[PDB]
Amino acid sequence: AAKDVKFGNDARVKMLRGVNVLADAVKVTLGPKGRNVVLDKSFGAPTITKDGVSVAREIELEDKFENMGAQMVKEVASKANDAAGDGTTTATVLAQAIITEGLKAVAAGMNPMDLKRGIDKAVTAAVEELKALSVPCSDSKAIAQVGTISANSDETVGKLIAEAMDKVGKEGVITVEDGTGLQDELDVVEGMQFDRGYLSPYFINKPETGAVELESPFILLADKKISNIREMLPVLEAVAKAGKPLLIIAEDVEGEALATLVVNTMRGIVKVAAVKAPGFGDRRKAMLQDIATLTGGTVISEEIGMELEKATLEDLGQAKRVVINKDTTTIIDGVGEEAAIQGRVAQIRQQIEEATSDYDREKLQERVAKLAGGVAVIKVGAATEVEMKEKKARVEDALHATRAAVEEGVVAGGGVALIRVASKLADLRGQNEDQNVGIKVALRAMEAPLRQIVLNCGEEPSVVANTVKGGDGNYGYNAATEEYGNMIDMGILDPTKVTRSALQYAASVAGLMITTECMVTDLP
Amino acid sequence: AAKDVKFGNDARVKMLRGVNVLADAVKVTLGPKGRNVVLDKSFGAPTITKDGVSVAREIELEDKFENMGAQMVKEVASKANDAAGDGTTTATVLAQAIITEGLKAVAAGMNPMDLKRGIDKAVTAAVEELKALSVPCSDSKAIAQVGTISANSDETVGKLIAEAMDKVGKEGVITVEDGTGLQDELDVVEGMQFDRGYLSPYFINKPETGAVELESPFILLADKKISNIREMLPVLEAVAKAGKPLLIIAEDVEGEALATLVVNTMRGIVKVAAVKAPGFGDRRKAMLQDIATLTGGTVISEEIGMELEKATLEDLGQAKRVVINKDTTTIIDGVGEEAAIQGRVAQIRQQIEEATSDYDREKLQERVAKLAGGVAVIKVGAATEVEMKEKKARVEDALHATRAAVEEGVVAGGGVALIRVASKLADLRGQNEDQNVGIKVALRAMEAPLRQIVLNCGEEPSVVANTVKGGDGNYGYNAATEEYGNMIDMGILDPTKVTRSALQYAASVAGLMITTECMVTDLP
Amino acid sequence: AAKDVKFGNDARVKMLRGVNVLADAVKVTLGPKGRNVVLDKSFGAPTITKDGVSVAREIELEDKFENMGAQMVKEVASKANDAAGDGTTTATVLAQAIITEGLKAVAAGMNPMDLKRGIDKAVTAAVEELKALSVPCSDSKAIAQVGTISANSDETVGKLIAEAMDKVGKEGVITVEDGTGLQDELDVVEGMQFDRGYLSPYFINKPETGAVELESPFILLADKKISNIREMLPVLEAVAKAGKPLLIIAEDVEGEALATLVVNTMRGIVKVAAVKAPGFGDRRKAMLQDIATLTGGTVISEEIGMELEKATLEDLGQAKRVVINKDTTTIIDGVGEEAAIQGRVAQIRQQIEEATSDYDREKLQERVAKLAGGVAVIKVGAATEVEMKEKKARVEDALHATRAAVEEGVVAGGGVALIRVASKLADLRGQNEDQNVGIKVALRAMEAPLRQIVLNCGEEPSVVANTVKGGDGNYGYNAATEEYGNMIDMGILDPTKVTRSALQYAASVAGLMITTECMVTDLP
Lengths: 524, 524, 524
Ligand SMILES: Nc1ncnc2c1ncn2[C@@H]1O[C@H](COP(=O)(O)OP(=O)(O)O)[C@@H](O)[C@H]1O
Ligand SMILES: Nc1ncnc2c1ncn2[C@@H]1O[C@H](COP(=O)(O)OP(=O)(O)O)[C@@H](O)[C@H]1O
Ligand SMILES: Nc1ncnc2c1ncn2[C@@H]1O[C@H](COP(=O)(O)OP(=O)(O)O)[C@@H](O)[C@H]1O
Ligand code: BEF
Ligand code: BEF
Ligand code: BEF
Ligand SMILES: [K+]
Ligand SMILES: [K+]
Ligand SMILES: [K+]
Ligand SMILES: [Mg+2]
Ligand SMILES: [Mg+2]
Ligand SMILES: [Mg+2]
Description:
Organism of A, B, C: Escherichia coli
Entry title: CryoEM structure of a C7-symmetrical GroEL7-GroES7 cage in presence of ADP-BeFx
Shape of chain A: elongated
Chains A, B, C: Chaperonin GroEL
PDB class: chaperone
CATH topology of the largest domain in chain A: GROEL, domain 1
Helix content of chain A: 40-55%
Oligomer: part of a larger assembly
Keywords: Chaperonin, ATPase
Bound molecules: adenosine-5'-diphosphate, beryllium trifluoride ion, potassium ion, magnesium ion
């Protein structure tokens, strides 16, 4: 199709206009005194959000060159959300500041590539300084502070997240889902549990709770389909001689076998419960092997070279309790040696180290948690649906921030750490004068987040910026209280990883955006 | 698609305009002197309604920012209708008042988040005060008063609902359906009845009434499809030896078996009637087990491990009377031990405590009522169809309000209880001045429902408001007679749950709406 | 459909306008101080590129005659990219210069065909001069310099490419793919490796690394689907007698055979691994024969006249080590006589000499590299996706330029070699005055690339051009440092093939475009 071509300063002006539109929409949500943005939805009611990436993903402009600018700058927030899960608004603010200063430098006659090289050098030095400035975050009080700050200063969210992270451990998994009441609740499950219930309600022996309960059972792990009871007679006779319950986990069990088992259950010969194997395909085999290692049994598969009729008691696993209901089966205190379990989790860790997509990493981490740690679920409580969505977003942000802080440490919040780094980088020089101008551009842009935080509070950004720059260490400005003090003492903590990622992504996109000379897009 | 972005006060003004349009449409229907709204229908005649949620669901605006405001405020009425079934107009009025006062406070330079926090604190305190202010509603006179008030002061509706609730009991179910005459009628069914008639008109032994009547029969409950008569010969012979009728409840019965049964019926060997089992799938099995527990019999199923030919007299249930017609089968005075029925209803209650959707809860409640309570149907009478729909809506509103009042108690009506609570909360303070302003905003908005009720009557809302505030206790204004007096003595009662829910939902939505700074929507 | 027809000067003016639009878009990216062009994408974010052909392929104009001019001049860049992979911007600049000067000559009253003949003669003489002016490029320092220059002066890219070329050899293959980190990495694989993993995870004997490792195995190469183990019994017995592992490469292996093999593996009877044969169709057979020649075995096929049951130890290949994992199989140090390997690579070389499409040529090259050389992969590191794409394009350009420089030598860069050639051709004369004017047009156009390079730097092209023309040899202008000196000493090298190809293609298109008199296109 026919194209429209713009050259030089006209193209740069249109690009800056689009960048400014997107950044102005995003930046009103930054800090403890930021506000919400209402986003229209074609299907349903509008959503009200304080998240930078959610606002950024909805912005599209009528003018095509301004739209090109906005689409270019949207990638900063997208990448920050993908990487750290937090700090998208800060990244957008940094990108806009760099783009504006660099365009000013280009309009005065500077070489764009040298400016880009200077910006890259300054950002590398800043990343080194941030790494040197970090402190470990291991105590639960610091984790609670990080979660509170990341959830727009909500103490309950931070306390709940700290409790969940303490209970579940280091190898566990925490997820957030919608609740039903008005208060947040935490449900932590220890051991192995999968979303499979009994295949027949007649297996229930405790009708008061509507659940199947078995004490010290046998576990028959079959990686096959059981349809004819003839394959099951020998082991059934053996367990009847033993006199303890049996739990059969199979891919599926047919009607004749169900009828035989429910007949044998209530008649008193044997106590039997049957459920379906979790997962589909190779992952189902992996979960079956995990259960076998946990309970100390062996999976009966055709592909390995054994048949069901030849099974013995040694092949069956064992546990201490089994609780089954309509939806979930939990194995409690399965007898297994720590050597095999540790080997299995080490294998799954090595598998995690060689996987690409995040979904597969999440599934493997869930498996590791089921083997070694625990699983926690946080149910968010709210009166309405818009409130529920907003609070769920805040809780997820706090969860991501706590993970990042635990893995990489914390720095002073409120934009203070970036200012300290920029002050520490005041002697850095490049190869020529344009590279020095680029370094100065990056150092100036490093003060934008604090200025925006103060501007959102209704104060004067230049005065607060000068007062903070006059200090040293963790001295900073509390925007919620409007007071100066030690950032660490008042609990305004930022994870180091979030700050570093925001800086790197913003610089990477803005450096390329500065070097533009021509624009090609479709005609209106 | 391309987006339109508005910032700050322009966005807030447009949102307030949309909110005002929706609230102005809704509020004309509030109180004893509210009026009706005609809603156009694409398929058919227009509907005339006084319901707040019905009006709110139909409002959509041409301007997109005002439409976002209206769509946001619609959720209050939707949530109130879902929760209590009544009090949607009051919730909409409260939400509009909070939004207006909060936008005024924001325009003067207050921090929206602190205003929202103050509003939340005031609403929590108000909920506590309302709980402390409630009184029990157990007598039938108070229930009749509540039903009369909720049906727009219709004494016949309240009296009918009180009679139905007294006859049916605590565990029963009352439904409202269209009638045929000009008068409302109440039909109560005691015992077990399901919507299945006889499978052959030749079973009729009393052609005067066109129905099958059996005195002290046997009940054969088979969870299977009967096609060949050979399965049924032994029990038929045994019943013929016994000499009293038999009722066969099965999934279905084939033509050969029907022919054999109708041949044996009039020839005098045995008295037999056959009907289909109610329900489809698991619920059919649940109802079969319920009938088995009620009549003291056993269900003949293959999946449990028994066959029909091996049935004896023990497996057959017993009753005192069975009446069957074209459409319904009723079992009167089934012979069962109270322990089994109480256990079964306890199991179904525990199942109700673990259900999510309202349909499943309603079905379980109907089953519990069939086991223990009764079932009532109210047929509404009206000359035309618009009148029919209007009166049916009013009766449903009264039914929901009586349920809420029975479960949680009643307070003074006419907006008096909210005024008393706001007076009790006059000393509440927050953390800073913006939170105090938010508390004051909530307390001021708590007087809106009475002001709107009086304004609809054509009186002066400020004078009545001051006079009511000068009183104490249940002193209030009777808008129907234009007099002052004790609200409780005059029968103007509001359920506590409706008032509390309206307050909570209105606050939850309005607090978020106050904190908006930017709006993003599609271009016109 | 109806046509629009233009004659003479109007048509030539419109065509020149379209040429100028495309060339102005392209030329802003030329040289060390060129800038980037943002190209809009219908599906996704815009791409930022410094490549001439990428910009040229996106240009289409609303006016149909100008569009005809642009479409005509786009073929120069397309052909240069197809031929050398580099030098598209230089070719576009040369074509525009020739077109402009030739149109000026035509407008003064000269015969276009004689001008075209003079241009052709000058270009032939220039190609001869460039061939005489080239010097060999064999040392790694010169290759690194060429790669650095072609990657827009990135020393790391040039060093990495030189290392890869040294490690892999002359007959190897180097590819560029997306990385995951922020730094470029090089992975070189020696021997034969194909993208096939094991057919069963139970073959694994080293669970620590999750891989199958076999020391001094036998290799069974069969172009057949194995389903029944009965065909495989004799060779399995024989290798069990031998006592060394066996690797089975087949088209596919059925489930019964997998079960038998996995049962025999862990039981200590024999050590067996099985994978699928790489490729589909004739190429699969070629790869099987290549593996057979490498390992010294024979392929079992029905089409040659042998059966699997009759196989012996002589038919089985041998190797030193075999490593198999989820995705790749690697045969390390297969025992084979160099005579057969050399014959096979000579056969594939002769096949390469008689193939048309680039896909077949590159596949044959990969096969030759697997037989004799190595395979290297360069993973590009970048923070974002736009940066990733830009850097990947630069690395690919450097790779193509290094290949061209190795095969045909290098000349002075910066547009100096063309100027020297034009100076050497100052005595060339044609048959008549129009041909002399055409020769002068070509000689004048040969100075355009340096002028554009200097203009992009913000300097004065005429002054630099005169200063360079006043010199001799490799004297030139360094546009990065704004200094004069020896082109070769400061490492500004251009491959001879790229320069010659750009000149030839630009002349070929521009000569035809000069001779236009009438234009026929569709009505608007
Ligand atoms: N009380 C406070 N005083 C000063 N700065 C704060 C305070 N609370 C939070 N901040 C700062 O505000 C920022 C919060 O940004 P936020 O709105 O979450 O956007 P994002 O995290 O996506 O950049 C953090 O960098 C934090 O350092
Ligand atoms: N006679 C009366 N005098 C004063 N207030 C009344 C009288 N009758 C009803 N009301 C009040 O009017 C309100 C009923 O409003 P209604 O139109 O049913 O809307 P909603 O959907 O909010 O229930 C109740 O809060 C009740 O207290
Ligand atoms: N430092 C330098 N000084 C002068 N000329 C240079 C320098 N670096 C590169 N060049 C010249 O710039 C040209 C590179 O142009 P480029 O943008 O790659 O377009 P093309 O597609 O024609 O290769 C080469 O011909 C090279 O001779
Ligand atoms: F808006 Be940021 F991601 F907290
Ligand atoms: F109009 Be409300 F629901 F009584
Ligand atoms: F733009 Be050229 F192909 F380096
Ligand atoms: K934000
Ligand atoms: K109403
Ligand atoms: K270029
Ligand atoms: Mg955040
Ligand atoms: Mg009502
Ligand atoms: Mg190049």
